[PDB]
Amino acid sequence: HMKISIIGAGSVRFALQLVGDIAQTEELSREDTHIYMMDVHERRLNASYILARKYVEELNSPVKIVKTSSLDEAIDGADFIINTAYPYDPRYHDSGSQRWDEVTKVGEKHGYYRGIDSQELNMVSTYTYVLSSYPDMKLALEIAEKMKKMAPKAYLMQTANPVFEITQAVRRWTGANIVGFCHGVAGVYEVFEKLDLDPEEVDWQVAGVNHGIWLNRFRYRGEDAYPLLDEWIEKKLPEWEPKNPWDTQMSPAAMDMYKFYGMLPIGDTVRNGSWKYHYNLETKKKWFGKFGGIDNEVERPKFHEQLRRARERLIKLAEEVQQNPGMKLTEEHPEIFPKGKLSGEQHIPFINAIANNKRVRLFLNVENQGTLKDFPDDVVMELPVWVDCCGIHREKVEPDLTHRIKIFYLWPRILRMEWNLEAYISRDRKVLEEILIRDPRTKSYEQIVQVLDEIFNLPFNEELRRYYK
Amino acid sequence: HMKISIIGAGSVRFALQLVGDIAQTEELSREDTHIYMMDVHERRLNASYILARKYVEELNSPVKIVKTSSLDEAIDGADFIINTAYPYDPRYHDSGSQRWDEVTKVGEKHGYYRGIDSQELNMVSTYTYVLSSYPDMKLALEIAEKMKKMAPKAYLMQTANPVFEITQAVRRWTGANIVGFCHGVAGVYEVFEKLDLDPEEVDWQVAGVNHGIWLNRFRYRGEDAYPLLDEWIEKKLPEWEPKNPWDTQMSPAAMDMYKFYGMLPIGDTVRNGSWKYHYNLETKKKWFGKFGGIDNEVERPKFHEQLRRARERLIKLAEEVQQNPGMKLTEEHPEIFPKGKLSGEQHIPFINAIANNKRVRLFLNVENQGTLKDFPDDVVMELPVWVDCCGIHREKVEPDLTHRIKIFYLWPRILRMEWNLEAYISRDRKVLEEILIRDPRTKSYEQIVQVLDEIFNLPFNEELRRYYK
Numbered sequence: 001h002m003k004i005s006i007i008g009a010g011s012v013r014f015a016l017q018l019v020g021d022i023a024q025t026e027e028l029s030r031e032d033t034h035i036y037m038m039d040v041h042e043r044r045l046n047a048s049y050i051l052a053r054k055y056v057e058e059l060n061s062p063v064k065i066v067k068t069s070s071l072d073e074a075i076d077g078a079d080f081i082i083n084t085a086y087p088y089d090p091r092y093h094d095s096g097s098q099r100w101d102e103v104t105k106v107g108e109k110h111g112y113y114r115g116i117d118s119q120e121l122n123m124v125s126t127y128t129y130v131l132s133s134y135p136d137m138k139l140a141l142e143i144a145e146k147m148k149k150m151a152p153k154a155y156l157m158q159t160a161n162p163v164f165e166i167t168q169a170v171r172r173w174t175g176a177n178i179v180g181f182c183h184g185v186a187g188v189y190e191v192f193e194k195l196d197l198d199p200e201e202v203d204w205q206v207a208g209v210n211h212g213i214w215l216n217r218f219r220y221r222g223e224d225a226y227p228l229l230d231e232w233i234e235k236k237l238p239e240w241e242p243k244n245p246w247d248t249q250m251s252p253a254a255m256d257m258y259k260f261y262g263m264l265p266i267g268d269t270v271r272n273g274s275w276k277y278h279y280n281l282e283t284k285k286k287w288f289g290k291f292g293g294i295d296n297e298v299e300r301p302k303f304h305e306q307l308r309r310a311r312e313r314l315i316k317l318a319e320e321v322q323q324n325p326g327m328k329l330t331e332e333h334p335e336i337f338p339k340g341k342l343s344g345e346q347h348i349p350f351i352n353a354i355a356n357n358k359r360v361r362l363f364l365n366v367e368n369q370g371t372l373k374d375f376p377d378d379v380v381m382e383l384p385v386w387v388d389c390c391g392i393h394r395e396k397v398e399p400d401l402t403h404r405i406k407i408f409y410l411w412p413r414i415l416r417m418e419w420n421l422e423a424y425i426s427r428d429r430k431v432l433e434e435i436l437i438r439d440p441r442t443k444s445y446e447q448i449v450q451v452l453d454e455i456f457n458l459p460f461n462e463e464l465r466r467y468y469k
Numbered sequence: 470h471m472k473i474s475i476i477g478a479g480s481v482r483f484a485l486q487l488v489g490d491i492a493q494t495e496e497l498s499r500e501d502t503h504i505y506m507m508d509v510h511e512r513r514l515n516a517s518y519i520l521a522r523k524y525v526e527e528l529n530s531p532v533k534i535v536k537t538s539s540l541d542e543a544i545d546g547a548d549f550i551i552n553t554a555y556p557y558d559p560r561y562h563d564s565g566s567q568r569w570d571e572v573t574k575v576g577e578k579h580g581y582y583r584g585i586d587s588q589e590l591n592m593v594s595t596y597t598y599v600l601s602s603y604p605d606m607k608l609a610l611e612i613a614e615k616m617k618k619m620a621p622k623a624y625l626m627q628t629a630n631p632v633f634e635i636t637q638a639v640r641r642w643t644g645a646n647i648v649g650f651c652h653g654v655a656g657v658y659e660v661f662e663k664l665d666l667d668p669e670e671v672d673w674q675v676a677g678v679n680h681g682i683w684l685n686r687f688r689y690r691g692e693d694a695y696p697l698l699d700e701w702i703e704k705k706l707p708e709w710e711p712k713n714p715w716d717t718q719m720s721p722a723a724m725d726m727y728k729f730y731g732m733l734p735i736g737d738t739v740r741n742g743s744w745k746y747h748y749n750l751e752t753k754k755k756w757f758g759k760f761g762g763i764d765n766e767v768e769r770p771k772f773h774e775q776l777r778r779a780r781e782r783l784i785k786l787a788e789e790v791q792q793n794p795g796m797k798l799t800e801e802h803p804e805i806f807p808k809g810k811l812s813g814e815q816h817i818p819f820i821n822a823i824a825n826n827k828r829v830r831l832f833l834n835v836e837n838q839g840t841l842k843d844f845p846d847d848v849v850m851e852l853p854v855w856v857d858c859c860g861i862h863r864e865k866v867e868p869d870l871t872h873r874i875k876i877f878y879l880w881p882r883i884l885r886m887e888w889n890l891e892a893y894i895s896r897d898r899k900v901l902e903e904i905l906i907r908d909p910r911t912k913s914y915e916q917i918v919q920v921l922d923e924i925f926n927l928p929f930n931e932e933l934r935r936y937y938k
């Protein structure tokens with residue numbers, strides 16, 4: 001009996017991907033595999049459940065799917081708990097992106113471009129919420145404590161943001177068996193494609209923290225391959241153009257960071273630069289090309305609207321499935337319901353490694369434990385690991401990250417994580433103030449007080465306001 | 470034979486203090502004690518030598534005093550080398566304070582209040598020079614390398630700023646026997662005086678980095694004494710007034726920092742707060758009282774002019790001594806030439822501990838070596854140590870510094886030291902730029918380039934400009 005529970009199974013960016021992967025993984029697509037779909041949004045949960053059931057049928061998979069509005073029921077005796085939830089106050093909002101949107105506009109009103117949650121080395125939209133990410137950390141810690149009673153052997157597979165802060169806090173404060181998941185390492189394959197390198201011929205490694213990872217080893221035919229990137233920078237960077245707002249891996253910003261740090265930032269790390277690349281939209285367009293990346297006042301609202309429409313369309317699609325049970329989702333919407341191909345995400349490979357000993361190399365957020373020797377043992381890093389039946393085994397990171405990455409990038413970002421955790425556990429508004437006192441956009445202490453006041457006074461922040469009272 | 474060499478013996482703030490202390494220390498005031506006074510400024514050196522000789526005579530001390538314009542001669546076979554030098558370009562300036570003054574005004578011209586060298590947790594005027602402190606680190610490293618050849622057993626007693634950065638760099642890059650010296654810990658005695666506590670009855674300890682030290686233990690009659698500070702804050706802080714621009718130990722800023730960190734910052738640490746206390750002069754006056762402290766555009770030029778006049782007066786006084794050899798310096802200028810009382814500084818007690826086994830507790834800048842276990846072994850900290858014939862022995866720091874001091878204060882300041890060292894050893898202007906990219910006062914990258922350009926183009930920065938070319 002194998003219980004895989006998806007907390008936040010109304011999630012538009014994970015739910016069906018996870019079900020499809022499980023149903024197309026030979027060792028997991030069994031009658032003994034029970035997928036629990038749990039969510040607080042009844043319409044989204046019902047929709048996700050209908051689609052998941054129909055989808056699994058078309059894939060001819062025998063997995064059992066259960067829906068529940070009870071967190072306890074989903075956790076009870078689970079083998080794996082995947083946290084993709086994004087809390088929201090249902091009195092005012094329909095999804096969690098709305099609270100970040102609105103607090104961001106309040107931040108900008110008081111002179112914080114892209115909101116107070118956007119900070120140096122932490123520009124990724126929605127990553128933190130009012131610095132300490134109260135609703136998101138609260139939920140993860142609640143899951144962790146229920147787990148230690150009701151599912152001791154379970155892995156908590158943390159996907160909801162902030163992955164770094166939350167994974168650290170749950171590990172440190174509860175010792176629950178939490179592992180943070182993010183696939184930003186996939187950006188390396190674009191580097192290899194742009195440099196005309198067969199990926200199977202590249203000897204590569206990446207290491208760092210979540211959204212702060214670096215191509216520390218990049219070798220080809222028994223030589224350092226970074227000279228090939230130097231040649232690309234000289235000859236092809238002038239003609240580089242982003243295909244869409246998300247396309248930044250080979251951007252001027254990424255290469256400027258590589259020149260300074262000595263290793264290429266990978267994936268969302270490229271979004272998480274210094275303020276040099278982010279002062280305003282015109283600056284973002286210089287360094288990321290025509291869209292200004294995704295983390296700006298034009299493209300991010302556009303993307304969040306796209307997600308809102310997608311949720312709504314999936315609810316209508318589920319109703320169409322109930323009205324037309326003969327329709328084939330895999331035929332009429334192959335983009336949403338792929339068949340044959342796996343998604344490439346790391347969650348189900350991890351489960352199959354633990355449960356079925358299908359050993360695999362993954363990039364996961366786990367305690368350092370000496371892998372990067374200049375950093376504390378207990379600090380959660382995003383590291384190359386091999387996973388199998390019987391443990392998570394860290395690769396030796398070689399070559400080591402450069403001196404400049406350590407002192408100018410990793411340590412400041414790790415300190416920010418500690419600031420954010422202290423802001424949460426202390427319940428002390430003065431810690432939030434201190435974080436903003438280190439913010440380049442702050443002009444005065446009075447400004448800090450006023451922006452936090454207005455954020456805290458938003459109706460949907462009642463619980464947050466009382467937490468810090 | 471005991472050779473004590475003062476490098477920068479024209480120093481207005483140390484030279485005569487050191488000579489008077491040596492001449493009034495029984496075990497050192499001997500014919501076998503040779504004090505070498507070395508300086509590049511001929512008139513100041515000649516003046517300091519005349520006054521030192523006359524002074525020692527009036528103290529009836531048999532120490533021999535030698536003057537030399539040769540650094541090599543001063544280092545050769547020295548037992549102790551005290552570095553109080555403050556480099557300057559003699560084509561344009563007469564002393565080292567002038568280059569900092571002028572670069573500060575350039576910084577302010579480009580929108581950096583109190584200059585680019587003033588940073589969060591690093592407001593102390595003149596501490597660094599263009600971030601990496603090129604002339605000051607260059608001299609210290611030169612002394613260190615000459616030492617390892619010409620005076621292997623010597624201690625390099627580093628007093629010139631930046632003490633933290635320089636002591637770290639010399640230790641790490643040369644392994645010379647350097648110890649950093651600063652007496653900011655003396656602020657604790659004001660705390661005890663304001664709280665009506667006999668200092669001999671107080672069980673206290675301080676620890677941190679240079680100008681970043683904290684009253685980690687403060688106990689009285691077998692209880693924590695910090696409640697007595699809480700009572701003073703409630704009852705007497707409203708009436709507190711600074712006696713002069715330097716008086717900050719019991720200021721609103723110091724108490725605001727104590728409330729946040731849980732321990733009282735000591736001495737110049739109180740100057741080295743966040744930008745909360747330093748946005749502008751009006752802000753400084755709110756938090757430090759009527760003068761706005763010493764690190765502002767009114768009081769610092771006043772103080773540097775006072776030092777310039779003092780140097781000039783000592784040169785004239787030496788000429789008066791040559792014209793009137795019967796005058797008694799100890800009678801007509803007891804403030805400059807004290808008799809009987811020692812100065813209370815740590816330099817000569819240290820020498821007497823090493824050379825004569827007069828064991829003493831001092832607060833010195835030495836490698837951490839596990840004393841503060843959450844920090845690297847090799848990072849130079851300002852620590853309570855016992856010094857004797859045969860070593861420097863670190864006290865156990867108990868209680869440990871608070872979590873907030875570690876993550877919000879010590880680690881950021883330690884990272885800044887690493888940034889500044891990297892800026893020096895790399896010879897890479899991009900590192901200086903990155904430091905300013907983390908500066909809250911930066912509005913744009915172009916501003917950074919322009920302010921460094923104008924600083925580098927100052928005539929007296931020719932050597933610095935070529936170093937970074």
Ligand SMILES: NC(=O)C1=CN([C@@H]2O[C@H](COP(=O)(O)OP(=O)(O)OC[C@H]3O[C@@H](n4cnc5c(N)ncnc54)[C@H](O)[C@@H]3O)[C@@H](O)[C@H]2O)C=CC1
Pocket residue numbers: 007008009010011012013014038039040041044071084085086087088095096097126127139158159160161163181182183307
């Ligand atoms: N680690 C990674 O690779 C990535 C992280 N994320 C993050 O994953 C999370 C979800 O992202 P989206 O799919 O866009 O959000 P979503 O709003 O589409 O889905 C979140 C689901 O969680 C539900 N939910 C809210 N509170 C809940 C609670 N207490 N218990 C159970 N369910 C609850 C919501 O009703 C909703 O259905 C966010 O934190 C997002 O920032 C998003 C993309 C990739």
Ligand SMILES: NC(=O)C1=CN([C@@H]2O[C@H](COP(=O)(O)OP(=O)(O)OC[C@H]3O[C@@H](n4cnc5c(N)ncnc54)[C@H](O)[C@@H]3O)[C@@H](O)[C@H]2O)C=CC1
Pocket residue numbers: 476477478479480481482483507508509510513540553554555556557564565566595596608627628629630632650651652776
């Ligand atoms: N660690 C501590 O307790 C304190 C640190 N300081 C620092 O000590 C240093 C001196 O301070 P002041 O007495 O006010 O300066 P000062 O200008 O009065 O004396 C510096 C002396 O060093 C000489 N000098 C310059 N380059 C030299 C070189 N290559 N070799 C030999 N001598 C050289 C100068 O001619 C001058 O006579 C500064 O760095 C200052 O910031 C000042 C007060 C306390």
Ligand SMILES: O=C(O)[C@H]1O[C@@H](O)[C@H](O)[C@@H](O)[C@@H]1O
Pocket residue numbers: 124125126127161182183184268294
């Ligand atoms: O921008 C986004 O919404 C997402 O982008 C992905 O790349 C990040 O891994 C994830 O943390 C973000 O939530």
Ligand SMILES: O=C(O)[C@H]1O[C@@H](O)[C@H](O)[C@@H](O)[C@@H]1O
Pocket residue numbers: 593594595596630651652653737763
């Ligand atoms: O302000 C100053 O000039 C001096 O003040 C002292 O307290 C500091 O110890 C020293 O580093 C400074 O050089």
